[PDB]
Amino acid sequence: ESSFMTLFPKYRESYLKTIWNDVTRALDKHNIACVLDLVEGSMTVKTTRKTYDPAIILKARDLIKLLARSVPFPQAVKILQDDMACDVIKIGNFVTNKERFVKRRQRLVGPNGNTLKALELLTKCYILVQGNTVSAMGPFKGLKEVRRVVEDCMKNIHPIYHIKELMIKRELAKRPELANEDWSRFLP
Amino acid sequence: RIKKYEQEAAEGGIVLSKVKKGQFRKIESTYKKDIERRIGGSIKARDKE
């Protein structure tokens, strides 16, 4: 019945073969079968005659997609957690000069990854930057926030402005005195 | 460990903080295990060299 596949490369295939008990364990726990074809270089996820969760089989499709895009197994079980979400953001369709593109995604990732990790803390998601793709997984509020932020980041506002926006926003919503105010009296 | 991390990133292409030629990387490994204090930034002898 319901079945999906995804290709991978070989340097991840080593990791796949070394961890492959864990994915089939979690997935037959959710009554999802998974198999692995080496000459095909692909993974396969299918359902059986007992599976009762369409949400979880779409989730398993997301699982092999993320594992093909080379995120480790802690993040894999964090997406197979229910109220989480993967999300892919492309940046390659913004700017003209290649060198400016390089320096701008370096401005994103920041010295010692610090801007990226502060963003990950303040949104409770995980980010990973691959050239023209940026993968992110976590809750939907953090995902919407990081989508706005990275699009303005490959535009030309700075992530430091965004990080100050995030911490001020989270505090101002934490103090349970304001829910009517548009908060632009506080944000610069 | 740092070299295997660098190889996995550059094989499955990630970006990473660019550091000078002396020091090592700075990972969650070294931050949690707290190895900077008992190994250091770099080989100081080769640094002066």
Binding site: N112, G113, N114, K117, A118, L121, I163, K164 | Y31
Partner: peptide, 25 residues
């Protein structure tokens, strides 16, 4: 980058992650 709280949070951004796995104040 002249701010005081900002950059301290920025360089502690990996330490709080490592000892956490947010109480950042």
């Amino acid at each position: 980058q002249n701010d005081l709280e900002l950059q301290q949070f920025l360089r502690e951004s990996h330490l709080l992650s490592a000892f956490n796995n947010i109480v950042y104040q």
